[PDB]
Design a binder for this molecule. Structure first.
Ligand SMILES: [Zn+2]
Lengths: 1024, 173, 173
C-alpha cells in the first residue's frame, strides 16, 4: 500500500501561519486568488495536493495538546480568542518568551523566492524515488527556512509554547498511526535500549578504545534505525529527533552521492548541513565519518502497522514482526562489520598488525559471531477501538499516546531489573577447561590470561614484556619478520593481552573509516565501502590521556617554538609535519601547523623514564613549566530527563518531589498543583488566559464538578458571538471537556504527553548537543560521546571548572557569545533570527574525575558512573523554595581526586528558572571558585587560604546572622592574603547550604564554603 | 519626512538625553495607549559599546539593538553623528506593529565611530534589577507624556516591556 | 595575522578593482581550490551603488551584499571613508567555510556617507548577463588571485561559481 501521505502533513500548515492567521501582510493570500490553508495549499505545488479528510484533521488533533488546552472547536477557529501579537513561548517554562514581529515571506515576490529553492533542491531526485524527496525535504525543511533569514513562529498565537516547525514534524510522526488505523488498524510505539552502555565504554586501555567502543554504540544502533528510515522514511523516529542529527545528515549526503545527483546540488545542500547540522566544521568531509559519536542510547519509534515484502506495504503479519526484525537487524551490523574488517585486513595482508588481525579474525570466527553490546527491544500497540468512535476521534482519545508511552517506559524499567552482561552469551566452558583457546603470542603459564581491556574474557593475543620484543615477536607466530614489529607495537603495547572483542575495538581504532559499513547501511556493498578505504591514506590520530595531560605544555612550546627549537633539532619536537593527518579533536586539528609535531607520544618524552630529566632540563632553560600527569574526565548527564518525557514534574522540583512520589501524587498535592496551575496560566497568553484562569480557580478543593460553566460559560459564550460562524459549539460541553482536560492534568500531577511535547524536547536535545560540542572544543577537550543529554569528555584539569560553568548555563539556554552559528538568548537558542527553545528547568549534574594519565581507564569510567549515578542519587542540599528552605537532590557537579570529594550545587533555587532573571545565577558558585582560583595563582591570595578555613569554619557554620558571616569570610580571606588590595566577595546567598549524604562511602563536608575549599584542593591537586 | 530619532534602551547611565527639543509635531511612536510599549525598533548588526552611549556597527547580521523611535532633535548640533537617511517606513525590523504607516521618514540614529583601536566583541545583555529599570524609564521616556505616571493604569505593564522587549548586545571591551 | 579588505561585486566597469596594490603578505582568506569559491562573506544592508560606489548602507536584514575578502592595501591609502574595524572573526556571515580561520582582523570597509534624502528604492536581483561576469574577472582575478584562474584544472566554472553566489543590493538611485 502506497501511503506516503506524511508530506501532506509536513506542509499542512506553512511556516507563516501566525502572520497569515490574524493577518499582518494579508496580501500574499491576496496575490494568488479558510484563509491559512490557502497559503498552505499554494506552496504544495510539487506533487499531490492537500486532502481535507483523515490526513491532517485527526492527526493535527493528537499531534499536540493545543487542541485540549485551548479547546477543540476554537483551536480550529482562529476566531474570537484572537491576539494580534506573535509571541513565542518556551515549552518547559512559560515566563520566558521571544517576540516574532515580522520576518517572513510577505508577498508572492518573496514567497516564491524560497519555493524555487525548495524545488531546486528536490528537482535532482528522480520523481519515482519519492523516498528521497521526503528524506531530503525532511531535514532541509527548516534549514532552508533558517538560511532565508526568517523568525521562527509558534504553532498557535493563543498558546505560543510550540514552534510551528516542531508541531509540523509532530503531526507527521503521528501520521503513521492515523494512516495505519484508517486501514486495517494497528499502530506501535517501538522502543530500543542498549543494556550497559557505560560498561561497554569502560572496556579499553586507551582513549581510541574508549572512542571506538563509544562509536560502536551509535553505529550499531544507527544501522538498525536506518532500516526504518528506508522503509517508512523519517518521522518514525521520535528519539533521537532526526531534524538535527549529525548522523542522519551524513547518511543523507551519501545517499545523494549514491545513484547520482547534481554535483552542485549535493554541494548546494552541503553548505546547509555544514552551517546548521554541524557548525562550520567540514571535518567530517575530510574524516569521511561523523566526527562525534552521538549516542542516542534510548530510541523510541512510532511505527504504523504496515509491513513491506509484498513489494509494497500490507497488514503486519504478527505483532512480533518488529521485535524480531530489530534483533536480527542489530546482529547483522555486527556481522557486516566483522565482514568488512576481515576483507579490509586481508586487503592489507602485509604492513604488520593486520597479518595479526587476519590471524585472529579467522581463528575466532565463532566468538565474533556474538554482538558485544546486546540491545533490548520493547513494544506496545494501539487499535482503532482505542482511538475512533466510528471513523472520527473519540473523547479521551487525546490521552492514548500518553498512556501508550507510559506502558512502554514501564516495560523498560521492568526489564532493567535483570542485568545480563553481553559476555554471558558467549560459550567459553570447553575453551577454558581444555586448552582449546587460540592464543596467538605467549602461552599462558596459568591458564588463559584474561584480557587487559575487558578483564572478563580470556585473551587471544598475548604480548611479551619489554625484555625485548623483536627476538620474542619474530620467533613466535606474532611477527613474521622484524619490519612489522614497529607496526604492531604502534597499535598494541608490549605486555597487553587482548580478547577477540577488544582487538576488534583496536582494529577499528586503527581504521575508523570502517565504521561507514554501519553508518550508511544497505547503501553500498561491503566491498565498495572497503575499496574507498584502501583507495586512500587517511590517517586519523586520536589523543590519549597523556596527550590531554600535555595541552598547556604543547601550547607553551608552540609559542616559544624558535627558542625551544634549535637545541633539539632532532627529537621530533621540531619535526615538520610530513603528512596531512587529521583528528576529530578540534585542538589537534586547530594547531598541527606550528612546526611542533603534536603526534609525538609524550611517554617517550617528558612523561618517559629514559628521557624525563632531559626534557625537565630542556623545559627548565626556556621557562616552560613541566607538565602535570593529570587530566579531567568530565561526564555530564541531565537530571530526570526520561522522567520528564513522562510529563512528570520531578525535573522542576528535584528533591522536593522525587520519582517515588508519583506512586501517590496526593501527598505532594500542594506543590504539584502550585506549579501545574502556574504552567497552564502562563502558557496560552492573550484573551484566552483569563478564561483558563477561572477554570483552574473552580477546581482547587474538590470544587464544582462541572458546575463551573456558570463562571466560564460567560467567558466563552460572551466570546463566541465575536464572529458569526459557530456551527454546533455546545458551550456547556466545550467548557466541560476543557474542565475535563485540566482535571486529569492536576489529578495525575503531570503534563499530558503528546508527540509535539516529545519532538520539541527531542529536537532541543539535539540542538543543545551542538552547542555542547563547541564548548568541549573551546576548552581544548576531547569528546568521547555526547548524545543528547549525556556527555563524556576528557578536559585538561585547567579548563574543567569554567567548562562546567559555561556548559551548565548553555544547557539552560543562557550564555555569552555565540559558539557556532547559534547564540544563547536567556533560554532560547537562536540560529539566524530563528528562536528555538532549550531546557532551562532540567537540572544537569556533572562528575569530574581528576585522574593520572596512567590510571586504568576501566576504573576511572566505572567510578564516574558509580560516583555520580549512585552518589548523585543520595546528595541533598538546602535549596530555597518559595521562601522556604527545602532539601533538593540533583544538579550537583561532583568532583573527585583519589579520595577527596567535593559537591558544588548549581541551582540553589528549586524551580531552577522561573523568570529571565534566574539565569545569571545558575552555576553561580562555580565562578566563586573560578574567581578565587584566579586570585591565588596571581599571588593575590596565598594557597594557605585553603588550609586555614578549618578554624573559621565552625564560626561560619554556627553563625546564623548574615551580617556577621560576611565579616568572618572577609577576615578569613584577608588574613592569609598576600597583598593589601584584594577585595574578594562571596555572593552571600551561599551562607548555609548543609550538603548531607545518607550513610554512604563518600564523606562530604556539610557546608558549601567548605566544599568550595575542597574543590580548589582537588583542582590544585591535579596540577602537581 | 518625519524628523525621527532613536533613543535606545540599555542599562547604561549614558542615555540621559543625547537629544533635544521635540519632533516638530505629535505623531509619535510611543503607542502605549493600549497595552504598554508598542511599535518597537531593533537595528540589526550593531553594538551598544557599553560606554560612550552611541551605537557601533559590526558586520554580522546577528546583533539586536532595540529602542523606541521617539523623534525630536539631535542636540540641535550634530549632522555627522547620524546616518542622515530617508526610510519609506517599510524597510525596518519592527516589533508590535499597528496599522501600516505608508509614509516616509527622516533618519538620525545615535552613531559612535567604529574606531577599532580595540577589538570589537558582542556581549549579550538585558534589563533586570528593579533599580536598573527605575533609573532610565524615569530619565526620559516617562516624560514623553508625563501623563504616564500621572493616571497611567498600565504602570505594571509598561514596566515589564523594558525587560521583555529591549535586549541589546554590549561590547565586552 | 594580516589585515584584510572585502572587495565587493559591481555591475559596471567603474567599481571593480578600486585598489592599486596586491597581497603584500602570503596568507589569504578566499580560496577557489577546484570546485567552488570558498570563504566568501555577506554583509547586511550595504549597497555599493555599482557606480560611484563606497558602500552605502541599508537599514534592514533583507538587504545584503556578498564579495570575497582579499588581504590587500586599504584602497590606495585614503584616510577619509573607512571604518578602522576588526573583530575576532567569529562574527562574519561567511559562505562556504573551509578550515580553521584566523581569529583576528584589521579591515577598513570603505563605507561612505549614505545616500541622503532619498528613499531605499533597493533592488533585489542576483548577478546575470554573463558579459558582466567576464567584465569583472577581466580586472579582478587575472592579477589579484592569478596563482589559480589561468591553468587550473577547471577555471571556466569559476565564472560559473559567481553565477550562483552573488546577489547584491543596490539603491537604484
Ligand atoms: Zn577484552
Amino acid at each position: 500500500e502506497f501511503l506516503d501521505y506524511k508530506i501532506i502533513a509536513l506542509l499542512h500548515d506553512p511556516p507563516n501561519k501566525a502572520w497569515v492567521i490574524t493577518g499582518r501582510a494579508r496580501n500574499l493570500t491576496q496575490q494568488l486568488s479558510r484563509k491559512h490553508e490557502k497559503v498552505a495549499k499554494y506552496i504544495i505545488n510539487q506533487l499531490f495536493g492537500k486532502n481535507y479528510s483523515e490526513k491532517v484533521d485527526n492527526a493535527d488533533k493528537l499531534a499536540s495538546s493545543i487542541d485540549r488546552y485551548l479547546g477543540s472547536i476554537v483551536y480550529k477557529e482562529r476566531s474570537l480568542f484572537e491576539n494580534r501579537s506573535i509571541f513565542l513561548k518556551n515549552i518547559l517554562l512559560s515566563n520566558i518568551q521571544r517576540d516574532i514581529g515580522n520576518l517572513f515571506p510577505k508577498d508572492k515576490s518573496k514567497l516564491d523566492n524560497l519555493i524555487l529553492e525548495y524545488k531546486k533542491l528536490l528537482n535532482v531526485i528522480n520523481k519515482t524515488n519519492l523516498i528521497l524527496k521526503y528524506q531530503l525535504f525532511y531535514l532541509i525543511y527548516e534549514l532552508v527556512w533558517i538560511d532565508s533569514k526568517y523568525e521562527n513562529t509558534p504553532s498557535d498565537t493563543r498558546n505560543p509554547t510550540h514552534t510551528i516547525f516542531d508541531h509540523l514534524y509532530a503531526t507527521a510522526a503521528m501520521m503513521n498511526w492515523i494512516l495505519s488505523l484508517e486501514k486495517e488498524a494497528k499502530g506501535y510505539l517501538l522502543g530500543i535500549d542498549t543494556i550497559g552502555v557505560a560498561d561497554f565504554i569502560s572496556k579499553g586501555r586507551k582513549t581510541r578504545d574508549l572512542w571506538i567502543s563509544s562509536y560502536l554504540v551509535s553505529a550499531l544502533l544507527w544501522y538498525v534505525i536506518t532500516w526504518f528510515i528506508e522503509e517508512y522514511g523519517p518521522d518514525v523516529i521520535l528519539f533521537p529527533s532526526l531534524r538535527f542529527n549529525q548522523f542522519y545528515a551524513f547518511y543523507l549526503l551519501e545517499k545523494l552521492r549514491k545513484e547520482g545527483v547534481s554535483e552542485d546540488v549535493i554541494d548546494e545542500i552541503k553548505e546547509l548541513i555544514t552551517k546548521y547540522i554541524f557548525n562550520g566544521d567540514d571535518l567530517f568531509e575530510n574524516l569521511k565519518i561523523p566526527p562525534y559519536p552521538i549516542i542516542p542510547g534510548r530510541i523510541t519509534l512510532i511505527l504504523p502497522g504496515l509491513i513491506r515484502e509484498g513489494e509494497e506495504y500490507k497488514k503486519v503479519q504478527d505483532d512480533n514482526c518488529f521485535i524480531s526484525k530489530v534483533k536480527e537487524r542489530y546482529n547483522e551490523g555486527w556481522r557486516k562489520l566483522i565482514e568488512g574488517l576481515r576483507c579490509y585486513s586481508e586487503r592489507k595482508r602485509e604492513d604488520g598488525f593486520w597479518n595479526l588481525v587476519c590471524r585472529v579474525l579467522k581463528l575466532t570466527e565463532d566468538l565474533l559471531q556474538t554482538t558485544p553490546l546486546n540491545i533490548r527491544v520493547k513494544q506496545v500497540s494501539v487499535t482503532e477501538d482505542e482511538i475512533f468512535n466510528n471513523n472520527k476521534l473519540r473523547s479521551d482519545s487525546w490521552k492514548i499516546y500518553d498512556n501508550k508511552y507510559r506502558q512502554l517506559v514501564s516495560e523498560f524499567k521492568k526489564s532493567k531489573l535483570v542485568k545480563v552482561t553481553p559476555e554471558s552469551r558467549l560459550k567459553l566452558f570447553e575453551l577454558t577447561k581444555f586448552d582449546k583457546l587460540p592464543q596467538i603470542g605467549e602461552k599462558s603459564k596459568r591458564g588463559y590470561e584474561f584480557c587487559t581491556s575487558c578483564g572478563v574474557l580470556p585473551a587471544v593475543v598475548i604480548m611479551p614484556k619489554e625484555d625485548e620484543l623483536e627476538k620474542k615477536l619474530i620467533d613466535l607466530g606474532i611477527a613474521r619478520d622484524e619490519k612489522d614489529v614497529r607496526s604492531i607495537k604502534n597499535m598494541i603495547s608490549p605486555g597487553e593481552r587482548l580478547c577477540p572483542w577488544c582487538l576488534v575495538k583496536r582494529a577499528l581504532g586503527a581504521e575508523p573509516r570502517l565504521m561507514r559499513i554501519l553508518l550508511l547501511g544497505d547503501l553500498y556493498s561491503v566491498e565498495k565501502i572497503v575499496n574507498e578505504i584502501v583507495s586512500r591514506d587517511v590517517k586519523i590520530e586520536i589523543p590519549s590521556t597523556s596527550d590531554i595531560a600535555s595541552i598547556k605544555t604543547f601550547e607553551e612550546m608552540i609559542e616559544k617554538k624558535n627558542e625551544i627549537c634549535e637545541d633539539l633539532k632532532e627529537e621530533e619536537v621540531c619535526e615538520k609535519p610530513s603528512e596531512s593527518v587529521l583528528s576529530m579533536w578540534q585542538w589537534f586539528n586547530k594547531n598541527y601547523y606550528n612546526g611542533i609535531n603534536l603526534t609525538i607520544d609524550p611517554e617517550e618524552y617528558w612523561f618517559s623514564e629514559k628521557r624525563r630529566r632531559y626534557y625537565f632540563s630542556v623545559f627548565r632553560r626556556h621557562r616552560i613549566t613541566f607538565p602535570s600527569p593529570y587530566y579531567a574526565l568530565v561526564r555530564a548527564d541531565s537530571d530526570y530527563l526520561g522522567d520528564l518525557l513522562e510529563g512528570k514534574l520531578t525535573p522542576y522540583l528535584a528533591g522536593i518531589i522525587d520519582s517515588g512520589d508519583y506512586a501517590n501524587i496526593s501527598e505532594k498535592k500542594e506543590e504539584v498543583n502550585k506549579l501545574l496551575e502556574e504552567y497552564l496560566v502562563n502558557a496560552g497568553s492573550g484573551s484566552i488566559v483569563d478564561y483558563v484562569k477561572t477554570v483552574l480557580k473552580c477546581i482547587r478543593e474538590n470544587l464544582n464538578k462541572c458546575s463551573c460553566a456558570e463562571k466560564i460559560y460567560s467567558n466563552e459564550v460572551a466570546k463566541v458571538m465575536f464572529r458569526v460562524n459557530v456551527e454546533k459549539a455546545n458551550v456547556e460541553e466545550e467548557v466541560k471537556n476543557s474542565l475535563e482536560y485540566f482535571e486529569t492534568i492536576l489529578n495525575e500531577g503531570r503534563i499530558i504527553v503528546t508527540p509535539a511535547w516529545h519532538v520539541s524536547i527531542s529536537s532541543a536535545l539535539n540542538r543543545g548537543l551542538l552547542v555542547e560540542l563547541e564548548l568541549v572544543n573551546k576548552h581544548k577537550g576531547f569528546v568521547i560521546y555526547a548524545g543528547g543529554d549525556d556527555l563524556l569528555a576528557m578536559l585538561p584539569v585547567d579548563e574543567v571548572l569554567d567548562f562546567i560553568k559555561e556548559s551548565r548555563r548553555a544547557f539552560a539556554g543562557f550564555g555569552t557569545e555565540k559558539l557556532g552559528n547559534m547564540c544563547l538568548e536567556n533560554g532560547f537558542v537562536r540560529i539566524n533570527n530563528a528562536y528555538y527553545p532549550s531546557l532551562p528547568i532540567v537540572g544537569r549534574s556533572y562528575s569530574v574525575i581528576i585522574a593520572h594519565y596512567a590510571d586504568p581507564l576501566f576504573f576511572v569510567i566505572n567510578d564516574s558512573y558509580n560516583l555520580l549515578e549512585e552518589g548523585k542519587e543520595i546528595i541533598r542540599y538546602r535549596v530555597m523554595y518559595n521562601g522556604e528552605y527545602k532539601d533538593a537532590k540533583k544538579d550537583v557537579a561532583i568532583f573527585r581526586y583519589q579520595g577527596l570529594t567535593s559537591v558544588i550545587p548549581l541551582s540553589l533555587k528549586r524551580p531552577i528558572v522561573s523568570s529571565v532573571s534566574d539565569f545569571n545565577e545558575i552555576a553561580s558558585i562555580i565562578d566563586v571558585i573560578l574567581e578565587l582560583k584566579k586570585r591565588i595563582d596571581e599571588g593575590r591570595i596565598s594557597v594557605s587560604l585553603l588550609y586555614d578555613y578549618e578554624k573559621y569554619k565552625h564560626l561560619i557554620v554556627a553563625s546564623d546572622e548574615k551580617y556577621l558571616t560576611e565579616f568572618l569570610v572577609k577576615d578569613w580571606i584577608k588574613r592569609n592574603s598576600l597583598r593589601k588590595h584584594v577585595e574578594f566577595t562571596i555572593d552571600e546567598k551561599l551562607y548555609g547550604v548543609r550538603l548531607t549524604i545518607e550513610n554512604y562511602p563518600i564523606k562530604i563536608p556539610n557546608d558549601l564554603i567548605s566544599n568550595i575549599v575542597y574543590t580548589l584542593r582537588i583542582i590544585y591537586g591535579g596540577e602537581k | 519626512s518625519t524628523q525621527r530619532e532613536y533613543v535606545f534602551i540599555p542599562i547604561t547611565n549614558s542615555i540621559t538625553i543625547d537629544v533635544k527639543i521635540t519632533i516638530g509635531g505629535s505623531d509619535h511612536i510611543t503607542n502605549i495607549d493600549e497595552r504598554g510599549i508598542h511599535n518597537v525598533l531593533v537595528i540589526t548588526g550593531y553594538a551598544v559599546d557599553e560606554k560612550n552611549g552611541r551605537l557601533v556597527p559590526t558586520l554580522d547580521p546577528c546583533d539586536y539593538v532595540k529602542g523606541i523611535l521617539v523623534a525630536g532633535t539631535p542636540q540641535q548640533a550634530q549632522s555627522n553623528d547620524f546616518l542622515t537617511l530617508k526610510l519609506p517606513a517599510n524597510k525596518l525590523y519592527l516589533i508590535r506593529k499597528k496599522g501600516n504607516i505608508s509614509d516616509d521618514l527622516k533618519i538620525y540614529i545615535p552613531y559612535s565611530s567604529p574606531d577599532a583601536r580595540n577589538s570589537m566583541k558582542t556581549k549579550p545583555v538585558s534589563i533586570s534589577d528593579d533599580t536598573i529599570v527605575n533609573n532610565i524609564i524615569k530619565e526620559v521616556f516617562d516624560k514623553i507624556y508625563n501623563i504616564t505616571q500621572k493616571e497611567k493604569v498600565k504602570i505594571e505593564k509598561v514596566k515589564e516591556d523594558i525587560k521583555e522587549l529591549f535586549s541589546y548586545y554590549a561590547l565586552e571591551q
